[PDB]
Amino acid sequence: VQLKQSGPGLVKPSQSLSLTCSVTGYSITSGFYWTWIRQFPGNKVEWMGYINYAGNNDYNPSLKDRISITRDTSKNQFFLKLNSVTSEDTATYYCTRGTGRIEYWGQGTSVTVSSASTKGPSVFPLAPSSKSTSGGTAALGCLVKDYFPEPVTVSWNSGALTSGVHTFPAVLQSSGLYSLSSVVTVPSSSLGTQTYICNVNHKPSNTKVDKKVEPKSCD
């Protein structure tokens, strides 16, 4: 079975969070508890509730009267709605299929509760040069600066380049916007002949950027 999540990653305080889980490989009416679980910054994990195969619910009492879990059997989808959110609801949200234990998990949706507006990143090159070459290895990268909210994804050469890549955790700047770098080490002898492009996707702002990173001469 596959659980594929969708829904916005930014919610304003006192508004409602809505997420969707699309199930394939198994009908949500045949059995099991179709379950929402969230994980906070700091790693605490909280069971939120389920809708079961018969359409009935159970919820964590910690979510008082703020939560509704519904379904659409014709699309094989189930849904989370969480009302009146605050910064205490910022978390990664997982849809899951459970039977006491939780065997199958969705990929997770990062949800940020904030009044701040979405903003797409600017992408700048970290150009390889003698200043970033050790032995026969050169490092290069992309600086992905000034976006909000999390997350961004970065690939290199459309996913053809994975070995030696380090995409750093974002840091929140004093401006209240995130920034990260993604770097990769490659043979210094490749710099003349291999093209290196970082592909940046910021889904919350619908921003996609391809940045070609070319060498520099430093001396």
């Binding site: 069971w47 998990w105 090159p125 490092a139």
Partner: protein
């Protein structure tokens, strides 16, 4: 509610060794009629969702190797990992499904110990693209080092910089158990143009003496132009 307490908040273990962690519940998870404990163990590797390891306190999921062993009964439980491998890096969670609401422990983070590895140090001047926008970000990369502890100091014309940089560190690598770290110095364009020497100095256990990488403002030229200088 049943409160789950995972005892070692984090532990460090070398490849090949054997390590154990405990999960204590505020009420017994053992059902008499069943003589089963309603407990599960999960493994959450960096960047991934939790993965079911053990259920009924000691039954392995399909595909889980025998070196993962859950034991205990009632209110005292244990996860043991033997023949530790580099890819065992993760947060391990316990979960009771004895009563509702279902509740989780807060996790035991398992880190891998290995031999010291000195960082490769690389520095990146700001791009003309960014300078045109009014800001200069200078990036210092420490690549593939162990242990995680490291010290990066920015100097601009030999003045130590403080308060104007931020660091980020990767999770431990699942193959070679190293870390990488970035330190990014941010100045206005006007401030950047007032100075010449930009230096990142790195101190680390694998470096018998500190390593400095530096450049002078303006000493770099776009790739391709070197045919006019060589």
């Amino acid at each position: 509610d049943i409160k789950m307490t995972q005892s070692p908040s984090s532990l460090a273990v070398s490849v090949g060794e054997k390590v154990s962690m405990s999960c204590k519940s505020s009420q017994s998870l053992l059902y008499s009629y069943n003589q089963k404990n309603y407990l599960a163990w999960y493994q959450q590797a960096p960047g991934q969702s939790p993965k079911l390891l053990i259920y009924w306190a000691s039954t392995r999921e399909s595909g889980v190797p025998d070196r993962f062993t859950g034991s205990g009964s009632g209110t005292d439980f244990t996860l043991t990992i033997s023949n530790v491998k580099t890819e065992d890096l993760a947060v391990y969670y316990c979960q009771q499904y004895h009563s509702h609401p279902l509740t989780f422990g807060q996790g035991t983070k398992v880190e891998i110990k290995r031999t010291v590895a000195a960082p490769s140090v690389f520095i990146f001047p700001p791009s003309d693209s960014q300078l045109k926008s009014g800001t200069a970000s200078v990036v210092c990369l420490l690549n593939n080092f162990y242990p995680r502890e490291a010290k990066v100091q920015w100097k601009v014309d030999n003045a130590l910089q403080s308060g104007n940089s931020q660091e980020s560190v990767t999770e431990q690598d699942s193959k070679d158990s190293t870390y990488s770290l970035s330190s990014t110095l941010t100045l206005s364009k006007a401030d950047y143009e007032k100075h010449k020497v930009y230096a990142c100095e790195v101190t680390h256990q694998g470096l018998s003496s500190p390593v400095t990488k530096s450049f002078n403002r303006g000493e770099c030229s776009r790739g391709g132009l070197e045919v006019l200088a060589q």
